[PDB]
Amino acid sequence: MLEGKVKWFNSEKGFGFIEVEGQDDVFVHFSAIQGEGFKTLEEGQKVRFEIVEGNRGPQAANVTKE
Numbered sequence: 001m002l003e004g005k006v007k008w009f010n011s012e013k014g015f016g017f018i019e020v021e022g023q024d025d026v027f028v029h030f031s032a033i034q035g036e037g038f039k040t041l042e043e044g045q046k047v048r049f050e051i052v053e054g055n056r057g058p059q060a061a062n063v064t065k066e
């Protein structure tokens with residue numbers, strides 16, 4: 001699992017990007033977020049994730065804060 005910070009995340013629309021130094025920013029959709037409760041992220045929040053890539057291009061998967 002990679003380590004990133006949430007660059008930004010629009011909490012009402014449910015998407016944003018994850019920073020990871022030395023690499024491109026990674027799109028994160030609300031559906032990638034793990035855990036219980038309301039699926040969202042805040043700015044500057046550290047995360048653990050995977051980059052999955054099919055024919056649509058790379059995005060985040062298995063995003064956990066803690």
Ligand SMILES: [Mg+2]
Binds near residue numbers: 051052053058
């Ligand atoms: Mg990948």
